[PDB]
Nucleic acid binder design. Structure first.
Lengths: 170, 267, 79, 197, 214, 60, 214, 70, 35, 443
RNA sequence: CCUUUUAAUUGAUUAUGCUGACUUUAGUCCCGAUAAACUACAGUUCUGCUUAAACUGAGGAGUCAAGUAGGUACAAACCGUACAAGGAUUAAUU
RNA sequence: AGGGCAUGCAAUACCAAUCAGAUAACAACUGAA
RNA sequence: UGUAACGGUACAAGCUGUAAACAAAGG
RNA sequence: ACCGGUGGUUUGUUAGUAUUUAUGUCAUCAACAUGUCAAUGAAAUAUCAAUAACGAUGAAAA
RNA sequence: UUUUUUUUUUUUUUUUUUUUUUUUUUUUU
RNA sequence: UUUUUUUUUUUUUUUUUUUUUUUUUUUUUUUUUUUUU
RNA sequence: UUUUUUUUUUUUUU
């Protein structure tokens, strides 16, 4: 039997090693979740006459309720301002850390496939799936119709060192 | 992480080297070996192989109690294949129908038609019990025991079983260029039968090729079953593919033919 | 003492001990132990040796003695 | 240590970041003797310390981890994970696909308590990726079998939640299902629980 | 020593040749390496830096023996050692290597000639040598005892090599063929483990354990 | 009196001695004593740039 | 190839004594003066050349040691060691430059961060006081309530701007706080390493895990 | 022991008449070495016996000089 | 020390006993560096 | 405690038996090793679900799925066909990397479906310039395994390989060469260029381990020039140690074929080199277990009924013979099949033609029996016997094997389907005759 | 030198006293069971004991000690020796 | 102090009821330092 | 902080830490 | 008058001084082994010449 | 052929030792 | 009769576990869904 | 006393 006897820790019932494949009951999970949920129960405060900016320029936004916030592009600091001390060039360049999709901009550059098909995702880069999900189903139809209508136009590129050709293409 | 950890090949323990004493342990480890499992256990283990038998045993009462006794016994377990290929379609279908009927009766219990059901079950149970019990034989009869009994070990009777040869020029021309260009043993009667059981031995096809790949010292002279082994045991003209299924109650042998009593045999 | 580091024996080693003592000399792992005594080796943990091309190299291990005087002479010009 | 989290931990973690998180919930190092703002934890008109937009980096990782952890999650935790991802706002189609698949796999093995939490993921305002017709059709079909063969086990509160889910979340139009749910709430042997719910 | 990182740009390992007093095969070279390197790492070092062809790499641990300061006019009785702990590596190169590099030579002690004596000696306290079965000796990938007479090999062996084993039997260490009828040994010419059919029938003798019963 | 390196190492080794209710103040050749040994001396006329003095307090 | 280990050395059996003596000659070690003018690639190649020379030298060293004799021209080793040290000195200074620069930039940003933080701190307390004052008088209407609402409205923007401005700095500041495998001695060997201290995570410490690495 | 640490110096104190000579084993060992050199074709005994400044090419000795009068 | 005896004893470094003395080569009065 | 004397004996004997038994198990275990290696530098990091909706899948997703299925050996028709259907739809949005993965998966799975290969080939042909080593290797490797020759595309593959030689891997280069040689699509000029590049590749960036893979009897005698032949042969000798039976066999075959076909080159070798090969033949080379095919057995039964003695299976030095007559050993038959010919065609393979010519040279009366001709006979024995008899009276085949008439996928399918039922009806009839059915129970 | 002082512990044949050297007993006592031959024309000395086979398709049937005890010039020195894939397909070269 | 500085002395204590260990779900469960 | 092991140095009661007895020249 | 640098006195000419290791025991434990880092000489940057003798340097030697 | 690793079976830690260096955006080629 | 072994793992049986999973090494063979048996 | 693709998990047994 060895001299291991007498110790209170001898043949202890239940242990770290013993229990390796046991999961907590859903009761605990539910309890925790509910507890966390029920921490900010209260009435509204402040004022909200006008709706929150959640849409592009021109288009109004009163009915389309959005749970997620949207960041403004025109409000971000520039690299020069960032690097300035306390008291082209980098005066019009911004390096943002966030969701591209959730950004109000005039234009967005996207990397599409050669066939120009929106199936699941594009090239897989960061934000492509976000962008394509945000975009409505009619994107596919528009691109499809455009393909057909254009045709030949989609099979040429400007000549290197040809600014006039680039402008004509544009 | 102790004094010694060597195992396997490198066994620290010391064993006896004497062949005389070593020759006694083999007998104890092979003949006087003890088994915990019963006959039923062995039978069940091969339920897949003998489903018919496995089901009949547990279906018809009496057989289960009979096959659990402490006294030594010998059992034969015919194969499903054997049954299928031996039995006629009508007999096979009729047997299966009655087995299913008994199983359905038990399922109904656990879950003049009333009078007729009693007579039908009474007759079918007796018929199947008679059929089943026929295989059972009192006493423990081993494969070696039978083989020796059949005169397999007698030099005066091993003449037709030891010297075997075949045309080597036809099967190994490259290695031979110069050539180019038993008795019946009677067993005790079964439990549900009075007639004895004859047993004999025969030479296998494989036995006639040993000299081509083995050192032989013969003196100067002056269908085929695919089962392995040099010798084939025929118990009542049923070939044994497997045997020596030792148990706490006896032995079990698998035969390639279902033994049917005369009482069940047609005219 | 008869047994131990007291007669120039030094620290215990695999060699100087019964079978079963586990002690290496410093290495890098290249796999893991299974539940049956086997060992699955992985090629991912092997280091990579980087060496530039040496087919055409003008440089040598040592410097010519005449270099010293030439380097020295340049200093005097700055005066 | 996002990548070291389990399903259980990750579900609650996700929920935390989705259920109107507050910055004052964090601990303090040698705070003043007076109480902390955490005592009240009421609906504020502003975001303390940081804005909600400063967590997408972490969100991405969370989702990725969820994706991985999906395969070793019991049935009970699986649905909680599923709902938590949608609540959080996991937009990643590649991430969602696998989740959907596993959910589909494990669907028949679930029951009404695990189906209501599933249905919660199809509420309005959530991403449309989770609203796959092939998924919702199987879910609403499975709910019918549960109500048909295990209707005596469902409680009044569960039936009330299911009625709201089948009308506002799933946007179903099955008059037979709606009538069965209505009948099983007023005609069944549930007066004692209905009066106390 | 310090562990080797994943990307090595300035390796510090120093490789050198070790002159051993034992006999070495043609395609085998003995090197001295640290005690912190692996087979793979050793292989790669030579493969990338030197670019030498390598087949096999064997490793051994070398530990110096203990010594005592007993000699001299003023001994200290203190313990010490000569040399350092290292890894004796053995590399099986593709090409041959001269013996004058790997093996030692000395004229003062004529007995010290591992290159000349080859494996005939043990160079240690090994009274009995050990030699496992050879590749050719083994069944798998082993030379056949009956393949010499085949048609196919002879085709290849056209006026270039004789496959008949009867043309390569030593005459100074072989006995004449005895008569089967007459008693003779088995090992004289029978280079196998089976009784030839030519041999007449042999009788068997069984020991009597209880002769008194007669 | 038998020779047992296992016993020796399991009862009289570096990790086994520390568990002993002994006078550790005594110097030990093959033991981990707790006696202080005063370190490297003062500096004479060598280069001031190459005089070592600390390590665990300075590691970075 | 493998031949390089002994080719041109004293160990070479295919050359005479005069050739070995002529080969034995050497010059001066590469100084920091010259080593500073070279680029990364030249120093990287010179490192391997010096390593090859050290490997060749060691053999002779050991050979001599064997016979209890001094190696011919022992200064070569010293020379090679000095060159090898000087190359790494150069490289390390090159690295330290960049490290310094980085440090400087972080200190530059810290100062603005500080002030921004302070301001935000103040504004949050004022907003909380206004929200509590508004909440205390819910079931009542007055001018004061409107006034407080206006002021809170003002402060909301006044605070949001601060966070918008603050975002960039926080990320940048918290650069080195987290570990980087790239900078670790395990995954790299370049000058200018970085070390980190292990943390205590109960969530991990309370779990049963095997010492496995794959 | 080579280290000279055991109690093997106790017996040596007392005088002795003689000691064993493993001639049988030594002879065998020598023979094996001789054979191992003979197969290559170099004489070891000859070199271990010849006079310091003596030259004897091949299997030659005193006997050789007998008939070689001229 | 035996297994049974060793299983009920703590390490000496677990206590403050190691910083309550001044034994050193110089003598019995040791002063720590930078004191 | 203490034990009974009776029990003691039994326990000790049992224990002893255990030892004996354990000693008796590791006999044949020679080549085993506790240590092993597993390839892990190919799996993707991203997680996928094979059992997912194919519609929601993309190129990336599908690519991953295909390879994971292959690795897990989840052979499911229902699963694979959906993959193929979705791949056909998404054929126009596949990256070179993805395509390669797809190909590798298909090939590893041995999923015989020409419909997909034929549809994916043209897109590969257009994206050849953007292709890489791995993709290029996988394409050919899959194609070879599935036995779908494409001389139009395979050649292009080779040319792109040659263009990107400076970026390619030795292994992939070697495999490409091998594949090309087996498919038979390399004109003389291409062959020459391939050989010239291969020699430099082997001599500059190849080791013992990598060199062994360059050994191929079919390739050696049809692609490789004399200068590369000699170098290969010479280096094999040196690199023989680090080899396997699979390479040994190939080497031996190479030697034999060279001797038989190119006496000059053979003689050009050195004495030492020659000796190696000479001695090689004398050794016993392990071989995998082999047994007759159902077609083989049917042919053998017809032959035996005709009244001719022969053998089932046997080895002859370095070549296997389907049928060998005992009365006249010179005679031999060969039973072909669908695999013996390219997909949708009846053209013989390079290995089959090489083995036919080597034996014809060596003097073997060789006859061939096709399967499409045989199937037509149905389950009639007299027709097969007459068929065989008519063949026997005719002269043997020429040295140079020729191809059969044209065929089609439709025809192939039809034939296969037809044969499916024949192989089952014959088995049923065979099996039924074994049943005596004598016993009759009264009951 | 003389004179004053000195807490020097200041005084020896001996406690079978402690630490060392060197005489007498005292060229006394102590020596283990079995050897011999190597020549002036060929050869096999006697005795005690009796597991001395090293591929035959099979790792010689094990453990432990030696903190490396059958390597090396009639060396108590220096210098070497532990390869589980057996590297010499070294059946060739000269 | 320009640069570099393997490994061992069992270390979440620059903090916090006690009682094994990488410092223990309640209870069982106890105490002169 | 104080110490033990391994490696280098001339194998050592010293020095030293694989960069193992030195960078002294940033336009 | 803090704080940095330099110098001197006392402790102390009257007092004392320890760091490395061969050997004992299972362990606790006990213990002052063996002149000096050292030919000698103030100086070896004085030890020359070799064949016996006589010769050289040094206060002194072969 | 052993040792290593699961079980027996034990932080009943064999100082300078290990599948054990911070715990997977790994650039799949 | 003095009343004697079983857990890691192997085989068999029963299944909705999982890249923590078998070479992108190689051979052989008539062959496999839905609108060819 | 576990033997050749790695883990989790249930019954019987020569």
């Amino acid at each position: 039997v060895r001299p291991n006897q007498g110790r209170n820790d001898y043949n202890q019932v239940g242990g770290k090693k013993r229990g390796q494949g046991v999961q907590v009951l859903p009761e605990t999970i539910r309890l925790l979740i509910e507890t966390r949920k029920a921490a900010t129960a209260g009435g509204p405060v402040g004022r909200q006459p006008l709706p929150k900016a959640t849409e592009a320029t021109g288009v109004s936004s009163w009915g389309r309720d959005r749970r997620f916030p949207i960041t403004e592009a025109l409000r971000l600091p520039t690299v020069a301002e960032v690097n300035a001390p306390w008291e082209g060039r980098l005066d019009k360049v911004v390096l943002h850390s966030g969701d591209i999709s959730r950004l109000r901009v005039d234009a967005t550059v996207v990397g599409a496939v050669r066939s120009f098909k929106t199936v699941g995702d594009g090239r897989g880069f960061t934000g492509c799936s976000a962008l394509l999900e945000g975009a409505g189903p009619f994107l596919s139809s528009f691109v499809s119709q455009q393909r057909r209508h254009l045709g030949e136009e989609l099979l040429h590129t400007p000549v290197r060192g040809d600014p006039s050709s680039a402008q004509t293409v544009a | 992480r102790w004094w010694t950890r060597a195992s396997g090949m490198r066994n620290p323990v010391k064993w006896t080297r004497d062949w005389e004493v070593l020759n006694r342990k083999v007998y104890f480890a092979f003949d006087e070996r003890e088994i915990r499992r019963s006959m039923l256990d062995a039978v069940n283990a091969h339920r897949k192989t003998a489903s018919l038998f496995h089901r009949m045993i547990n279906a018809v009462p009496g057989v289960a109690h009979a096959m659990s006794l402490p006294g030594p016994h010998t059992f034969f377990l015919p194969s499903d294949k054997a049954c299928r290929d031996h039995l006629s379609p009508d007999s096979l279908h009729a047997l299966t129908e009655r087995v299913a009927f008994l199983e359905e009766q038990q399922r109904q219990r656990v879950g003049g038609t009333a009078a007729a059901i009693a007579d039908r079950v009474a007759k079918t149970t007796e018929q199947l019990r008679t059929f089943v019990l026929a295989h059972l034989i009192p006493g423990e009869w081993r494969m070696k025991t039978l083989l020796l009994a059949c005169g397999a070990g007698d030099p005066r009777r091993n003449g037709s079983l030891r010297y075997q040869d075949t045309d080597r020029e036809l099967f190994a021309p490259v290695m031979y260029a110069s050539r180019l260009g038993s008795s019946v043993f009677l067993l005790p009667p079964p439990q549900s039968t009075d007639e004895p059981l004859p047993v004999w031995v025969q030479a296998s096809r494989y036995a006639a090729f040993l000299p081509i790949t083995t050192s032989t010292n013969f003196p100067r002279f002056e269908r085929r079953s695919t089962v392995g082994g040099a010798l084939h045991l025929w118990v009542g003209g049923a070939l044994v593919t497997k045997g020596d299924l030792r148990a706490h109650n006896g032995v079990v042998h698998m035969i390639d033919k279902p033994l049917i009593p005369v009482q069940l045999l047609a005219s | 003492a008869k047994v131990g580091p007291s007669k120039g024996r030094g620290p215990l080693l695999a060699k100087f001990a019964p079978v079963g003592f586990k002690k290496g000399f410093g290495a890098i792992g290249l796999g893991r132990h299974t539940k049956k005594g086997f060992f699955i080796i992985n090629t991912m943990l092997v280091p990579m040796f980087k060496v530039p091309d040496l087919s055409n190299c003008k440089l040598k291990c040592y410097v010519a003695p005449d270099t010293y005087r030439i380097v020295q002479q340049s200093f005097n010009k700055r005066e | 240590y996002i990548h070291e989290m389990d399903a259980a931990t990750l579900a609650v973690v996700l929920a935390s970041l989705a259920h109107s998180p507050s910055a004052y919930s964090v601990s303090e190092r040698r705070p003043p003797p007076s109480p902390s703002p955490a005592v009240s934890l009421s609906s504020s008109s502003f975001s303390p310390t940081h804005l909600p937009q400063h967590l997408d980096s972490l969100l991405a990782l969370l989702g990725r981890q969820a994706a991985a952890t999906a395969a070793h999650a019991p049935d009970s935790t699986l649905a909680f994970l599923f709902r938590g991802c949608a609540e959080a706002g996991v937009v990643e189609k590649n991430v969602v696909c696998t989740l959907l698949g596993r959910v589909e796999q494990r669907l028949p093995c679930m029951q009404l308590p695990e189906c209501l939490v599933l249905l919660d993921a199809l509420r309005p305002g959530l991403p449309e990726v989770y609203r796959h017709p092939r998924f919702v059709a199987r879910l609403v079909a499975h709910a019918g079998l549960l109500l048909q063969f295990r209707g005596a086990e469902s409680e009044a509160e569960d039936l009330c939640d299911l009625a709201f889910s089948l009308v506002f979340a799933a946007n179903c139009r099955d008059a037979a299902l709606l009538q069965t749910t209505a009948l099983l709430l007023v005609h069944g042997k549930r007066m004692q629980s209905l009066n106390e719910t | 020593p310090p562990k080797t990182p994943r990307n090595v740009f300035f390796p510090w390992q120093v490789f050198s040749v070790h002159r051993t007093g034992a006999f070495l095969e043609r395609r085998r070279v003995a090197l001295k390496v640290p005690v912190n390197l692996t087979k793979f790492e050793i292989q790669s070092y030579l493969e990338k830096i030197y670019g030498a062809r390598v087949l096999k790499v064997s490793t051994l641990i070398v530990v110096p023996r203990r010594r005592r300061d007993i000699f001299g006019p003023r001994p200290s009785m203190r313990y010490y050692r000569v040399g350092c702990t290292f890894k004796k590596a053995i590399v099986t190169l593709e090409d041959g290597v001269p013996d004058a590099v790997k093996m030692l030579r000395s004229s003062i002690e004529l007995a010290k000639n591992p290159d000349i004596t080859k494996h005939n000696l043990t160079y240690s306290g090994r009274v009995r040598a050990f030699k496992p079965p050879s590749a050719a000796q083994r069944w798998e990938m082993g030379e056949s005892k009956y393949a010499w007479r085949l048609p196919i090999p002879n085709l290849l062996a056209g006026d270039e090599m004789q496959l008949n084993p009867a043309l390569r039997i030593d005459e100074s260490t072989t006995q004449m063929f005895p008569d089967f009828s007459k008693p003779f040994f088995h090992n004289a010419h029978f280079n196998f483990s089976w009784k030839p059919e030519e041999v007449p029938f042999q009788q068997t003798v069984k020991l009597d354990i209880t002769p008194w019963r007669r | 009196n038998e020779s047992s390196p296992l016993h020796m190492g399991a009862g009289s080794a570096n990790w086994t001695a520390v568990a002993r209710l002994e006078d550790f103040t005594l110097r030990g050749l093959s033991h981990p004593p707790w006696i202080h040994v005063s370190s490297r001396p003062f500096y004479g006329a060598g280069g001031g740039a190459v005089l070592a003095a600390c390590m665990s307090s300075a590691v970075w | 190839g493998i031949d390089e280990l002994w080719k041109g050395s004293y160990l070479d059996p295919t050359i005479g004594a005069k050739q070995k003596e002529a080969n034995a000659v050497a010059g001066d070690a590469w100084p920091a003066c010259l080593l500073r003018m070279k680029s990364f690639e030249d120093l990287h190649k010179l490192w391997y050349i010096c390593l090859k020379e050290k490997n060749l030298l060691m053999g002779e060293r050991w050979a001599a040691r064997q016979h209890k004799q001094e190696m011919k021209q022992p200064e070569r080793l010293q020379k090679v060691r000095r060159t090898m040290r000087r190359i790494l000195i150069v490289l390390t200074k090159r690295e330290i430059q960049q490290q310094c620069l980085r440090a400087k930039d972080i200190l530059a940003k810290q100062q603005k961060r500080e002030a921004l933080e302070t301001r935000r701190f103040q504004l949050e307390e004022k907003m909380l006081q206004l929200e509590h004052r508004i909440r205390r008088m819910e079931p009542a209407q007055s001018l004061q309530k409107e006034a407080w609402q206006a002021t809170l409205d003002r402060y909301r923007s006044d605070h949001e701007d601060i966070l918008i401005q603050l975002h960039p700095l926080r990320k940048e500041t918290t650069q080195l706080l987290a570990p980087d495998w790239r900078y670790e001695r395990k995954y790299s060997d370049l000058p200018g390493p970085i070390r980190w201290k292990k943390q205590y995570i109960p969530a991990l410490e309370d779990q049963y895990r095997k010492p496995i690495r794959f | 022991n080579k280290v000279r640490t055991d109690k093997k110096e106790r017996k040596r104190a007392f005088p002795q008449r003689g000691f064993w000579k493993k001639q049988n084993f030594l002879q065998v060992k020598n023979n094996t070495v001789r054979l191992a050199f003979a197969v290559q074709g170099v004489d070891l005994l000859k070199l271990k016996r010849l006079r310091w400044g003596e030259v004897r090419k091949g299997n030659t000795g005193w006997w050789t000089d007998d008939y070689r009068s001229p | 020390i035996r297994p049974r005896k060793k299983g009920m004893r703590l390490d000496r470094r677990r206590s403050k006993k190691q910083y309550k003395h001044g034994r050193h080569v110089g003598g019995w009065n040791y002063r720590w560096l930078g004191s | 405690g203490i034990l009974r004397p009776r029990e003691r004996l039994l326990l000790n004997a049992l224990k002893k038996e255990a030892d004996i038994r354990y000693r008796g198990r590791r006999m044949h275990k020679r080549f085993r090793s506790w240590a092993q290696q597993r390839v892990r530098h190919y799996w993707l990091p991203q997680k996928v679900c094979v059992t997912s909706d194919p519609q929601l899948m993309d190129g990336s997703y599908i690519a991953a799925c295909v390879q994971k299925a292959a690795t897990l050996r989840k052979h499911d028709l229902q699963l694979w066909h959906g993959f193929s259907k979705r791949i056909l739809e998404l054929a126009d949005s596949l990256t070179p990397q993805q395509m390669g993965y797809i190909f590798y998966g298909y090939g590893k799975s041995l999923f015989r479906h020409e419909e997909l290969y034929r549809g994916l080939l043209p897109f590969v042909a257009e994206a050849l310039p953007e292709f890489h080593s791995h993709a290029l290797m996988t394409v050919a490797w899959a194609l070879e395994r599935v036995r779908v020759n494409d001389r139009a595309v395979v050649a292009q593959i080779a040319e792109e390989a040659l263009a990107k030689k400076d970026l390619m891997r030795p292994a992939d280069f070697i495999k490409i060469v091998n594949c090309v040689a087996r498919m038979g699509a390399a004109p003389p000029s291409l062959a020459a260029a391939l050989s010239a590049e291969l020699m430099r590749v082997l001599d500059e960036k190849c080791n013992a381990l990598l060199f062994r893979g360059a050994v191929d009897h079919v390739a050696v005698a049809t692609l490789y020039s004399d200068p590369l032949r000699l170098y290969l042969l010479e280096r094999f000798t040196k690199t023989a140690i680090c080899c396997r039976p699979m390479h040994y066999q190939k080497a031996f075959q190479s030697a034999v074929a060279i001797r038989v076909l190119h006496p000059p080159v053979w003689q050009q070798l050195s004495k030492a080199v020659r000796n190696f090969y000479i001695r090689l033949s004398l050794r016993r080379i392990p071989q995998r277990a082999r047994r007759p095919s159902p077609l083989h057995w049917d042919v053998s039964n017809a032959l035996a009924k005709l009244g001719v003695f022969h053998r089932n299976t046997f080895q002859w030095g370095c070549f296997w013979i389907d049928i060998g007559e005992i009365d006249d050993r010179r005679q031999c038959w060969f039973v072909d099949g669908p695999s013996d010919f390219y997909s949708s065609t009846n053209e013989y393979t390079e290995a089959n033609k090489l083995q036919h010519r080597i034996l014809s040279e060596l003097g073997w009366n060789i006859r061939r029996v096709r399967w499409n001709d045989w199937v037509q006979l149905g389950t009639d024995m007299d027709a097969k016997v007459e068929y065989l008899r008519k063949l026997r009276e005719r002269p043997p085949w020429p040295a140079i094997l020729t191809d059969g008439p044209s065929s089609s996928r439709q025809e192939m399918v039809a034939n296969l389907r037809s044969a499916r039922d024949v192989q089952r009806a014959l088995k049923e009839r065979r099996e039924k005759n074994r049943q005596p059915h004598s016993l009759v129970m009264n009951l």
